[PDB]
Amino acid sequence: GAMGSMERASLIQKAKLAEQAERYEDMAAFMKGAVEKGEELSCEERNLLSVAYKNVVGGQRAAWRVLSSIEQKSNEEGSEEKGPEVREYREKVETELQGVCDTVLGLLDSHLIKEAGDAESRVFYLKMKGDYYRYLAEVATGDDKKRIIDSARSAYQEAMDISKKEMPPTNPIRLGLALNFSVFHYEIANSPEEAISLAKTTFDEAMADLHTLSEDSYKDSTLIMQLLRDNLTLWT
């Protein structure tokens, strides 16, 4: 690993600099190096890891969608034949996206999840596992599509089970997990009713627990609750 010679603390320091510079590929490579030191990650470090890969894969997904839309248009009636280039380049971007997803899933499997015993760390990593299987599912069209979808569902479900047992309904990780699992139901699993039910129940249960929070925790929770409401508004 190219980061094998760099101190763990230096990798973390550089990940933070990369974030400030909006250099998310570098940020992800630094955090990968930090994970591969083999020590557990603190809360702040888990956030750096997630932020870096979310931003790298988010850019890839946006580009994939642009290319997929052009490719779809090419296969409509009366569209002029322009050769294999659009498919080839969509495939190139797709393969790079899959690679990044496989890299994140590999970090989670070797060995972040197995060493994560506290509810906050284990739920956070399982949410990530669901997320990266969901991104794999978005581009899957083959024999394994059902298994990729099921892997996303399974990770999200284990995270939900732990979160409901161990965390308050306003916890930002519980909220963010539910938000994303609801989107999985709507966009991936063809289950819009399940998506709407989950977003509503999560929002309402959080509402009822806001009274227990400090001002700062209230701000943190309500920010994510608004996204649940935004999705509900989109869907109804």
Binding site: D131, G176, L179, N180, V183, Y186, E187, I224, L227, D230, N231, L234, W235
Partner: peptide, 5 residues
Amino acid sequence: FPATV
């Protein structure tokens, strides 16, 4: 697209 975090 819907919101995720």
